[PDB]
Structure formats: C-alpha cells, structure tokens
Structure 1
C-alpha cells in the first residue's frame, strides 16, 4: 500500500464511525508509533498489511515492517517542533523549547503542549527535520494540562 516516508494517522472502525486513535512516522519502509496507540496489533495500509516487528511497553514504542530507524536526539539546548496531527484536523507544526523530565535513570526532554489523546505518536523534530522522538507519553499537571516526554527508541 502506502510506504512513502511521512506522518500518518492511525484509525479504527471498532468504536463509533471512523476514530483516530493515534499517529505514526513512516521512514525507510518502517512504521513507528507508540505502543498505547495500537497495543501491538497489525495495521492495514490500503490493501497492504503492516506487521509489528519490535516493541516495548516500558518505552511505550512499537515498529512495523522492520527495526526502529529513528536515531536523532534533542541536543538539550534548542527549540524543536511538534508536528501535531489532531483528530479530524490538518497537520500543523508548533514550535516550543522543551522542558526536562528528571528521572532516577537520567534526564529526558519534555514538551508542554495540550492536544487530544488521538494525537499520540506525532513526531517531534529538530531544525534539520530529523525525528528526535514521539509525543504522547507523559503526565497531567495541576489544571489538567499535559506534558509529554520526548520518547525516542534505539537504532541498532
């Protein structure tokens, strides 16, 4: 079906009508999304089928058709862009300076942008257009706002 590089919506016909459960990134013939979006299930691409190849619930990531290909990382200094793909709305770039999630295992960048849950999987980009992670696994703060980790996998 559709193996062109780019950002894609992840849709289901299980709930009412056609519902957007998330977003992903096609790069080098591999589809990259967050585990909570598909729960490891197969995906359809037109008349073609995408099978899961790698996944990890703790990292909250999954790849299809091949291993994880996204290896760029936030430099810890510069602004980035969330390429937000909200349900029923056009893809839109939003620029922000990431904050930090401090963990007992080290620090990770974090983006403080509020989007509906079906936006999970939207890519976060550096100034060269390289995907430095996916948006959608994070925490809810004080008034109900959302702060997402910049979640990135490892390219072997």
Structure 2
C-alpha cells in the first residue's frame, strides 16, 4: 500500500507491466492486467475503475493522478524494465496531435514489461503512464486519466 512504483508480475514468473501506488490507489494500464485482481503480499487489490479507450485501470479507489505535461519542459520516464533496477530516463516529449487536442508523447522504446511505468515532471508528479503508442520506432503517448 506504500506509495511508489511497482512491478506487475504473473505466474516461473514474468513481469507483464508496472504501476503507481498513490493515495492508496494502484494505477496501471488496462492492457497490462485487463482489470484482473492483483495480489500484494497476503492482501488483494480489487479493480475500481477502468477504460479500454484510455487504456487505464485503477484499484482500490478512483484514479488519483492529475498532473499534466506543461508542453515545454523535459520530463523523466521512471522506467522499471524486467530484471533491472528502476531508472530515470530524461527526454523532451514530442506531441500526438489529435482531433480532440494534443497529447505529449515520448520517443522511448523499452521492453513491453515496462508498460505502466510513470512519466514525471520536474516536481516529481506523475503526468501519465508509458506504454500505449504508435510506430513511426515506437513512440508512447503520455497517458493520463481523470481525477
């Protein structure tokens, strides 16, 4: 339940993704868990909200992350790749231009098990999650939910 970034594992064991614990809520991408319940130690985390189009899911409560890219500043991907210590990768986002507005995007290509890793602004707030994107090289939207 502690705040932080977490591996999402399945059972040998395999890392299928990453997520963020904040304010007692676990946040990850829908395509990682499909809303399945999660084990944390001897406890269980039950899904609370999810949306396939946004590719997001929260556990134990509503989506809590609400910071957004400022459109000018570099950001950091806090990547947690399978088998590797959590590490920060700094980058200037590009932009997905859509009919409903612009979305920050990071042109960073890490293993699939990194999906759900948080992207941070300079003050350390999560501005979205990594792992839903497009191929031009892979480019990930900065995917943020609604609080």
| TM-score range relative to shorter protein | over 0.9
Match of 2:27 among 11, 28, 32: 32
Q: Shift of the alpha carbon at 1:105? A: 1.2
The answer to whether residue 2 in structure 2 is matched with residue 7 in structure 1 is no
Give, in angstroms, the shift of residue 55 of structure 1.
0.4
Give me the whole-angstrom Cα distance separating, in 1, the residues matched to 2:78 and 2:3: 14
Task: Give every structure 1 segment of 4 or more consecutive aligned residues whose post-TM-superposition deviation is greater than 3 Å.
Answer: none
* 2:57 aligned counterpart, secondary structure: strand
Deviations 1:36-74 (A, max 9, x none): 000110000000000000000000000000000001000
Q: Offset of 1:100 from its aligned partner?
A: 0.2
| 1:55-74 pair list within 5 angstroms | 55-74=50-69
Shift of 1:131: 0.3
Q: Deviations over 1:110-155 (max 9, x none)?
A: 00001010100000000000000000000122xxx21000000011
TM-score for the superposition, normalised by structure 1:
0.93
Tell me, in whole angstroms, the C-alpha distance in 1 between the residues paired with 2:114 and 2:9. 11
Secondary structure at 2:63's aligned position in 1? coil
Q: What is the CA–CA distance in structure 1 between the aligned matches of 2:83 and 2:122, rounded to whole Å?
A: 27
- 1:71 and 1:58 map into 2 onto residues whose CA distance is 18
Once the two structures are TM-superposed, the CA of residue 23 in structure 1 deviates from its matched residue by 0.1
Match of 1:36, SS state, is: helix
SS in 2 for 1:77: coil
Counterpart Cα distance in 1 of 2:140 and 2:74: 15
Residue equivalent to 1:107: 102
SS at match of 1:87: coil
Aligned-residue offset at 1:104: 1.2
Q: TM-score, normalised by structure 2?
A: 0.98
Structure 2 stretches lacking a partner, 5+ long: none
